[PDB]
Every structure is written in C-alpha cells, then in structure tokens.
C-alpha cells in the first residue's frame, strides 16, 4: 500500500496536475486532501472544492473513499459529500490512479446526469427549470466554494 501510494504521489508531483492538487495530510499516507477547480464553462466556475480521500488497508485492491467537503449543488452529489461515481463502488480495478479519479470528478462536475440521480430534487429542478438550477448552483458556489 505504501509503495503504491508514494508512487502515485510522486507521479502527481512530477506531472503538473493543473486543475487539481492532491497530497497527504500531516505525515499520514492513508489520508489525502485534494482540491478541484470548478470548470470555467460550468455554473461552478471560479470555485475551489475540497475532497477527502481515505485509502483502505487493502489499497489498491479496494477503492479509495473519496468524499466532497465543500458543499456543492449537484444532482449526483448529496449533502454528505458522497459522489455517484461507478469507479469508486464496483468498477474499481487495481489499475486506476487518483489522477484519473480526479479527472472523472471534474468531468462529472462539467455535466451532470439527471437520468440516474442521487439527489432527486436537484435532478427534478435541473430537468424542469434549467435557469433556476443555474442560479442555485452559482449562489452555492459563491457562498461555499469561494474563500
């Protein structure tokens, strides 16, 4: 576990992550804090979102537990920060790095999927009244994702 985690950390260090920044907390290798920048072409533009990543003992043979910390108004992210991503529950394989997980999360932010929602009310607002969803997302990202 330690070897794989350090290899991923070094790979992140060598290659510029640009719109992401993941690293261990304190000196603990099984607890990372990551930052995601809201896409410009999205309601979350100009926002910084903090994520907590917990690597299990069986890593990379079990998926990391990735949870949002900054509150976000998204159809696939609930109030506990849980993310509806298939690669984190049952599609995880011991060949996916944290960089690909962060890219998947950024793609999820860039376009939600209301056909299989995790928060039905937000999905209903998105499908019915798009402008109100846009306003709510902008207000939430200005109220929580900026600071």
């Amino acid at each position: 576990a330690l070897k794989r985690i350090n290899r991923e950390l070094a790979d992140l260090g060598k290659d510029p992550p640009s719109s992401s920044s993941a690293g261990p907390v304190g000196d603990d290798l099984f607890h990372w804090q990551a930052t995601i920048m809201g896409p410009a072409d999205s309601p979350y533009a100009g926002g910084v979102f903090f994520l907590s990543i917990h690597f299990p003992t069986d890593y990379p043979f079990k998926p990391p537990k990735v949870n949002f910390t900054t509150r976000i108004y998204h159809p696939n992210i609930n109030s506990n920060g849980s993310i509806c991503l298939d690669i984190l529950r049952d599609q995880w394989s011991p060949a996916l790095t944290i960089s690909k997980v962060l890219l998947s999360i950024s793609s999820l932010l860039t376009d939600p999927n209301p056909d299989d929602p995790l928060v039905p009310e937000i999905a209903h607002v998105y499908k019915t009244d798009r402008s109100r969803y846009e306003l709510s997302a902008r207000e939430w990202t200005r109220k929580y994702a900026i600071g």
Partner: protein, 985 residues
Amino acid sequence: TIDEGLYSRQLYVLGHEAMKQMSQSNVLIIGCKGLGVEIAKNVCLAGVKSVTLYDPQPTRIEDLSSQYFLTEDDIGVPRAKVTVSKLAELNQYVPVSVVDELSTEYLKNFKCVVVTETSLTKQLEINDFTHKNHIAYIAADSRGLFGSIFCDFGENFICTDTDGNEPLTGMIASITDDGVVTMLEETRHGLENGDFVKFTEVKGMPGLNDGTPRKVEVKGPYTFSIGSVKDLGSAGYNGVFTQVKVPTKISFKSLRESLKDPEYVYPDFGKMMRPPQYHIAFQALSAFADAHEGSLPRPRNDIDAAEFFEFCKKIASTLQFDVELDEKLIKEISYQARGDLVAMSAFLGGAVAQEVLKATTSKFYPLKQYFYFDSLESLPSSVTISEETCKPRGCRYDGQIAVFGSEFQEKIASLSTFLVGAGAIGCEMLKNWAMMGVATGESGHISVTDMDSIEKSNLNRQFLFRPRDVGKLKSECASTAVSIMNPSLTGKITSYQERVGPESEGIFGDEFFEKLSLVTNALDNVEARMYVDRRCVFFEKPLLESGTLGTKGNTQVVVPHLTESYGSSQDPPEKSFPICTLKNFPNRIEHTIAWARDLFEGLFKQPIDNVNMYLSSPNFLETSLKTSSNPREVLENIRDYLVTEKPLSFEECIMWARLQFDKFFNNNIQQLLFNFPKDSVTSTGQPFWSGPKRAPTPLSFDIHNREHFDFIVAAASLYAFNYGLKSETDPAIYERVLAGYNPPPFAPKSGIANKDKQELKSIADSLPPPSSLVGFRLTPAEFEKDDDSNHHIDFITAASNLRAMNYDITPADRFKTKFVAGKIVPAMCTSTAVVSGLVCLELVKLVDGKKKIEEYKNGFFNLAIGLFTFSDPIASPKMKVNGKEIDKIWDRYNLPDCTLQELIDYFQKEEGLEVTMLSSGVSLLYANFQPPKKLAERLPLKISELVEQITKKKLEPFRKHLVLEICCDDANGEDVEVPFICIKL
C-alpha cells in the same frame, strides 16, 4: 421440523427438501476403523435418520492410529461396541446402533450401505444383492498413501440437481421475432447450450409468460436464442428470465460388471495413467489377503512385494488389461498396505460421506464410478524408510510407522506448531495432530488461539464441542477434548483467547514466533489471513492455509524462500451496490436488505452513540462542527433522542414506530414520485421507470396485515430496548394504542448572509447541559443474528419486505434475510474433513523439509460435482538489485538503529542507490521532496526516535524491530524495487 438453530449453516448448502429426505434414510456402515468411524461421524453430523454399525473384530493397539473413539483400555473389545457409545453423543437426533450379525436379507432396511475393510468376495456378495434391490452401495478403501472409492446407486438413479448452483436469472432488454433474447447493457446471462429458461413480465409477447421451459442456444456473452417465436408476437420488451433445472437419469453398473470395464474419476490430470494401475493393485491386494488368511503384505518386505507383483500380473492377464504395469508404483502400493493414516482417513471419509448424502438426497452429481487417489509425494526422503525402521513397535502409532518409520515419528513428536483459529477446520486439525502424535515429545508444543465462544450452531460441524460446552471458550474445550483423545498431550498444549492482529503483538512477539516450526490458519476472513501471512513472511515460517465454502474447498502451502506468500495473489472482492441504486431505485431483494440494514444502523446505533458521546466528551460539539461533514444531522439526532421524542412508556414507542413506518414507507415514496412522476421521460424520450428502475407505490398502514404489524412490533421493541422499557408482545395493547393515531398532514415540497451558523448555535443551546445529565445512558443495539429474541433479524426482514412491497419485489423470509444480512458463510462437515486431510498431507512434506517446488501441492475441490485438482505452488519472483539475485518476497535488509543520514549514506555507498521515500507503518519518515528545513531537523535523529516523533507515540518495551518500506532510484534515475528494511532496536 428441521432444527434450524443447529443446521443453520448446512441448510444453506442442502436445503429443506434435501434434509427432509435425509432424515428418512437409514445408513449401514460395515467396518469401524478410522475410515469407517470418520464416515459415521460425518453422517451423524449431517443428520440422517439412523446409523447402524457392524464390526465384531476385537480392538487392537494399532487401530488407534486413526480411530479417535478408541482408548488403550478397550483392547480386546469389539470396535463397534466401544465406538457406538462415543458416536451416540455427536447428534441427539440420530440414533446409533450395533448389529452383532449380518444377513443378506437384513440389508433391505437401509437406504445406503457403506463397506470398508472387507474382502472382494464379500463385496461381490453384498453388491449382487444391493444392485438388484435398488440400494445405494459405496465401498471405500485406504491403504497407506493410497485410497479408493466405488459408488453404485442403481441402474435408474435420478439426480434432481447436478451442480448445486442457484438457478440463473436475468433482466431482458429485447426479444426479436426470431427468439434472439438480448440482456441489458453489459449484463451477462451466464447460460450454457442446452439449458432451459422461463420468462416473466415480458411486454409485447405475453405467450412467453406462460411458464413452459425453452431450449437455450447461446450466441454470445450477452445474447442467446430460444427458437422461433413468430406466432407469439413480433417483438418483446423487457422482462425477466429464470433458469429451469431438469432431473437427469444416471445409470450405474454393478461391481462385478464394473471390475472388467471400470469408469475412472481422475483427481489429478497430471497423472492420468495411474488409476488403471491402482485398479489392478487393489484387486491384487485382495487376492493376496485371501491367499494369506486375510494378512496384508508386511511393511517394506521384498518377498511379499514380489508375490504381490505376481498376483498383479496374474490379475492383469485375467482381466485382459492391455496396460503396462509400473513395477515401482505397484510395489509401493505393496509396501504401504498396512499403513493407516488419519489424513487419508479424513480425506476419504469426507468424500464418502458426501457420496452417502448424495445417495440419500438425490442431489449433486455422484462419482462414476471408481475414484483412485494417491499422495505418494508425501513419503519422506530425508530419513531411512526400510523394513527395520517400519516394523511395528506395539504402540498406537504402528499404522503411521508402517508408512513413515520411527525416525520420522521422532521428527513429528518434536514439532512446535501454532494454530490460529479453533472453528471446524481448527477442530479437525487438532484431532489429526493428536492422532498423528504431533508435539508429544520433550521439545514439542502446541499453541492454539481463538477469542470466540461456543454457540449452538457451531456443534453441527465442530465435533469436539458438546451442548454442555456452550458459553465457554473454544480453545480450552478443544485442548481438553484432544488431551482426552491422546493422553500424551497433557501439558503439551497451550490455549489463548487472543485475536491475532496488530493489537496482540505483545503476546505473539519475537520470542513466541522464534520457537515455532509452522503456522496453520483456520480462519474465516481475509484480513486475519493477510496479517498472519505477513507475520510468517517476516519471521520466515512455513504457513498452511485452507478455506471452505459449502462444498468447495482449497488448501495452499507457503514455504520460506521457495514459494510466494498468501498475499501475492488477488481474490474477487465482495459486491457493493451503487449508492443511487440502494437509496432510490432498488430492483432486487439484496438491495432492500442492504437498505434495511442501513436503516437499522441509523435508527438504533448511530443516534445512541451520538447521545452517549455528547454526555461523555466535554468538547464534542465544537469538534463535531469542525470535523463532521453534516453537523446538522448529529445535533438533530441528539436533540430528538434526548428531549423531543424520549419515550416515557411503551405506548410512545409504538407511536414512534408508527411514525417511522409513515416516514420510511409512505412519505419518501410520495416525494420520489413527486420528483419523478410515473409518466416522466428521460432526456432521450424513453420512459423513466423502465428496466432496472421499478416504479414504487406508497404503502397505507393496515394493522391486520402481517408485515406491517411485524415491523411495528420490532421497531417498538428495539426502541424500548434502547430506552430500557418493558416491551410487550400482546396484540391487544398494539390494537388499542394504534387506533387513536392521527397522521400529521404531508405534502411533497417543490422547494422554490450565512444564518445557518446561528441556527446551529441555537440548536446546540437548546440541548441540556452535559453536567446536569450524568449517568444517564442509552443502550445502542449491536447487530446480532444468532439470537432469535433481540428482534434484529425480525426488524430487518420486516423493513426489507415492506420496501420490497414498495417497489413490487418478491419478498424473502427470515431464512434468506438472515443469510444475506448476516453474511453467513455456508459450511459443511465433509468439506472441512477433506481440507483437513489435505492440509495434514502437506504437513508431513513440511516436516520432512522438502526443497523442490514440484513436491508440494495446492489443492482445490468441489464436492457437488466431484471435482478435484492440484497444482504446484508458484515460485517467489526474483529480481536484480545491484547486479545480485534477490528474492522479492523473503529477502530483507538487516541494519542497526542508525540515524536517517547514516541510513541514506549506507544505501548510497553500499547498494549504489539513492533513497527517495522511507516509510514505517502508516507514516512517512522521509521523502525526497520535503522542504530542506524539515529534513535538516529530521536528519540527525535515529530511526526509533524519528518514528516516535512522527507517530507521537513511544515504542512499547516489548518491541524489538522496525519494518521500513523504502523506494529508491538508481544513478540513471530509474526506480528499482528493493526489499524491506529490518531495523534492530
């Protein structure tokens, strides 16, 4: 009337109908030696109607080599008479009897007849009668390291289930006019050619829903074909298909006919020419016994071997066998004729008991018909095995000395083993060790650890534990039982009650692990297996792993510096459903059961823990606000479970249960249908509630309905238990108190600077001060499945069935709900016996210290289909480090307790490598990218001091080493794998 409190694990393998048929079948067992007693024990534990024994031969000392129900005080007494008393205690529902005389016409009273230790003429006489009267006949034999099984269930045997697999089911996406059935997106049907399926809920082709099975023509992993459905319709949409399993007609041949033209079952495809040899060899053994007044060839005797080979040649000539006899193998069969090993007895007894269950239940595929097995790779080669060393000494180990010799017996008696776990495999392993004489010498010792206690359901396959032992520690009872079996083990066994893990390293430390000879795992979870494997790798000890699941089993051996460890391979992980599926859109009973377990945890465990922590920690509120993602939930739970909804009587508990019923089965469904109406469409125009998504319907409470009342009773009882009230089960109070409920109005909500901090502060201030409430605690509900009076499984079943009725899913019962929610592993006594036999056959290889990797065998088997297979262990990978051959698993660096700078200098100067990362445990001691100030602070510190400083915890006094993981780069900058570092404190 099956006692599910005892047969809980076995019913998950066999079923109710199978055990119902079993409980009406009689089994006769001829022969009461180790093999016969093993078969009888497994049959009694299985639960057949009755067992009858026939063995009038007086007991002899050598018989104690594998007969664990015989003591040295029973010499000269018939074996059946002294064995029936001990067998009658295993199961109270299975009487055990003894017959002093056998007649042919007496055989008609039995469903199955098992024959051991009998000559071929008697076997022919018995089979000529059983075959024509339709009685199942099984004949087993165990000669040294060789074994044989023969099954004959009649000419017209009917097998209802041929593989023991649950019927396959799946969801369809479309059915064309030509029968091309297509599964959903990326869903595999898993069918094979020639299978039968039935369809339900098919729209557009109602004819397919009648229920007639149809042939399956597999065309790919995602689609298959059923034929021409031109008349039934043009196209069908959605639906569910379920596999149909049909009975099979199996025809057996009699023993007399089968001797001439046998049909072999091959336990190993690496040696496919041997079973023809063993077929002649065993018949020659019978002929030799006939010609010498029933006396087998003497151990390692050359004259008897020559005579036996002459018999083999004569028999091969008579049977017109066009085979070439391997003289070495046949004479090896001759040498070990008088051997009686407990491992072979356990292996063959498990197999034969499974065959008996197949005969009595008409389930699983029987053997057809001869099963010849050998474990000749277990014969020692580091000691002298001759006539002089193999002659009997008049002791209880004569049966084993006849195979291995006295010197190997002395080697066995000086073992210092460590057994982790005391379950079914643990009990079998301890019994095998007691019979083999393990650790009965001056320098021998056995250590067994297990932190659990004996339960009622454990007695079904752990034969060392009696009903009087319920509530005591497993290890102590097992130690006492095996000391009774072999009195020489008095004082040679130490039992612990410790869980093997990171917290027990003060007991199982360097001193403990340095005196061992081998470690045997008898665990039931992968985490403990990985931990023990890491400990064995660090201490370089042999490890014996074994696992079972229903009728399947496997055994693996880990040898230092030779093979890979247990953790070098991967296993399929458990299935975890997407959170969206569980939370909103379930379509299987497993989804509803998982949701109900989460509901139980969130109603009876988490709020109680929050309340208790609020009254203990003096700084819980601020820490929760800072750390917890959603402090609102914690504050609301504390408020509700302290002041808002604290029950003063059981009536308020019933009202709370009614409120929760409305909350979780009527209102959330209304909200969901408000957000996504039943007529809504997706972004592409298709209906939303189609396929994997099932449209729900709110439930209206009806007191007379069984499921609603069950949920109300269970929820009220659990809430009262949380608040320590006097719960009741009288329906009158429920009826009179639920007739006055006033449902609060509910209407789904459409929605439409930072004051939430003020709201949180106001909520926090409303809570009573912790100082005022001291000593007031609420009891959280800890999930427990084995108790049938704590309402846990009742509540989970009721909630799961109510949610199933929400989404129109077929509800389950308490049996399946307990199986799924409880994560029960199906277990069998026969599989346990087989795995113990294989492990004890590898143990003698470990004792002999064999070096070649082709002499060890990892074993896999499935008794439902009669499949056995073996493969050599995988050799540990090698790598090149600084131009040297280094083992990637078993090699390490040994260094003193030097400073970090000195460690880096050593790796730069000795190995020519640059250290880039250095970690210990979970911390990060050193990394090449850390700022210069932090490094300059951490450079001149010793490794122990550095670890203590970073982890903020002193090293324990018993700690004697540190394990460090290091990643380093070569001169060119290429990363190179290196072994771990062992710092000596």
